[PDB]
Design brief:
The PDB classes it as transcription. The structure is cut from a larger assembly and holds chains A (about 375 residues), B (about 50 residues) and C (about 50 residues). By secondary structure, chain B is mostly helical. Chain B is built from three helices and no strands. Chain C is about 55% helix and about 0% strand. Classes of the chains: A alpha+beta (about 375), B mainly alpha (about 50), C mainly alpha (about 50).
């Protein structure tokens, strides 16, 4: 029960003229495909070219890359006289629309398409063209040495060519993006006072409906909805409070202090069917000083503890992250060494499990992290 | 002899060009579309007297 | 609307910032016709920059 000491006003008048607002209709928007089709219409194609262009633009993703191979498109046309070279010509024509480089098969194609539209006066263009055309994995893997051998070029020219490479656009289709992203309103709040975490539902999201009972059946049915809503929010609050009580240590000391709890614990604690617990916690979030977390985030698997008990997979992931974050660049830690290092604190996880956790956290293996 | 004259030619006109098979026409369309052009444009006051 | 006392009976005075917006596709066609813009996007950019 506090008052927000700062905020943003809403741009509108407090009172509206008494006439009723018109029914909501909507408003059209321009996505990438709409722009591409608009440019297609104003382009001197034939009829078959226009059909192939429609089929191609249909299969362009949000980033502007062509998701299907050309065989799918030529099959989708449904004609037999049309060959694959016509599809190639139409695709090459489409790839030069605005933004330049859209509908590209892969990154190499996009970069080459963008590079082909420069002027010859550019200081280092042929070097960049050759590097993209032939030796790309060398630039990605940060070799900088065998690339010097193959290119037969000194340091300065290669550095400038790489500077030109990192000046292009790898996602040309995201210039025309969505207007404004959505945001989620939290359902419950967990504050702390008296050394304890208080749990309370969002007041700004829970109004009390006016009871329409004066014309009095219908009154009893209306009260049934009230009782159902009461029971629903009571169940939500009880489940959230029990979950917060179980995971007290995490709320204080952050990660590496969760407990391996499953739906059975909640079902036995609140005396309810586990299906109801699964139903109520789906697509609902809680706001903590640490962030916003889905109500189902605290359930996970476990691993055996040598001294006794179990360790949350979230704690293992956090420990792996913190161990990797403080490794030596000269000799990055490997999976077996990581397992050996963690097998001193009672953590007993197989090498396969460590690999799965590392893949989940999206960290490159040791050989790609060496400096 | 110039890019403009080739550009102004429509596809139906070049289809009926003798000794010019459809493969060559598709290749010409490919090389034009690579640079951002197409067959069937229309320009006024051509040639530019040069 | 203001008063123009110099106009002839069949004439009206139009601001050019309005005329640029109203007559835009005609401008696109005229720009493409004389070769100043080989593609639609080039003409759109040229009109946006107000060259």
């Amino acid at each position: 029960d506090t008052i927000y000491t700062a905020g943003t006003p809403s741009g509108t008048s407090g009172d509206y003229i008494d006439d009723e607002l018109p029914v909501y209709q909507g408003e059209t928007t321009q996505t990438l495909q709409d722009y591409l089709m608009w440019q297609v219409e104003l382009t001197p194609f034939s009829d078959t070219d226009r059909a192939i262009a429609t089929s191609i633009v249909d299969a362009v993703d949000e980033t502007g890359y062509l998701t299907v191979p050309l065989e799918d498109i030529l099959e989708s046309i449904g004609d037999e006289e049309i060959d694959i070279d016509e599809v190639e010509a139409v695709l090459k024509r489409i790839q030069r629309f605005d933004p330049v480089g859209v509908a590209a098969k892969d990154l190499r194609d996009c970069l080459l398409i963008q590079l082909s539209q420069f002027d010859k006066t550019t200081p280092w263009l042929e070097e960049a063209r050759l590097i993209i055309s032939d030796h790309l994995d060398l630039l990605a893997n940060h070799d900088f040495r065998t690339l010097m051998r193959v290119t037969r070029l000194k340091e300065d020219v290669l550095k400038e060519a790489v500077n030109l490479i990192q000046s292009l656009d790898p996602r040309p289709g995201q210039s025309i993006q969505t207007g404004e992203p959505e945001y989620v309103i939290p359902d419950v709040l967990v504050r702390k006072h008296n050394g304890h975490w208080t749990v309370e539902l969002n007041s700004d999201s829970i109004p009390r409906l006016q009871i329409n009972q004066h014309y009095a059946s219908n009154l009893q049915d209306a009260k049934w909805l009230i009782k159902s809503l009461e029971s629903r929010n009571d169940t939500l609050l009880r489940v959230s409070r029990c979950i917060v009580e179980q995971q007290q240590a995490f709320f204080e000391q952050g990660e590496e202090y969760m407990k391996p709890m499953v739906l059975a614990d909640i079902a036995q604690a609140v005396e309810m069917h586990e299906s109801t617990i699964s139903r109520v916690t789906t697509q609902k979030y809680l706001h903590s000083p640490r962030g916003i977390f889905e109500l189902k985030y605290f359930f996970s698997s476990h691993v055996n503890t040598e001294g006794g008990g179990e360790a949350s997979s979230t704690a293992i992931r956090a420990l792996v992250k913190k161990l990797i974050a403080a490794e030596n660049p000269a000799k990055p830690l490997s999976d077996s060494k990581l397992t050996s290092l963690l097998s001193e604190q009672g953590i007993m996880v197989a090498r396969r499990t460590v690999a799965k956790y590392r893949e989940s956290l999206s960290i490159p293996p040791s050989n790609q992290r060496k400096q | 002899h110039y890019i403009g004259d080739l550009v102004q030619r429509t596809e139906v006109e070049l289809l009926k060009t003798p000794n010019l098979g459809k493969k060559s026409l598709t290749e010409i369309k490919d090389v034009l579309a690579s640079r951002g052009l197409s067959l069937g444009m229309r320009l006024e006051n051509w040639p530019p007297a040069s | 609307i203001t008063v123009g006392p110099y106009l002839r009976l069949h004439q009206c005075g139009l601001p050019k910032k309005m005329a640029l917006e109203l007559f835009k596709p005609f401008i696109y066609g005229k720009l493409e016709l004389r070769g100043l813009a080989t593609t639609i996007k080039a003409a759109k950019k040229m009109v946006e920059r107000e060259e």
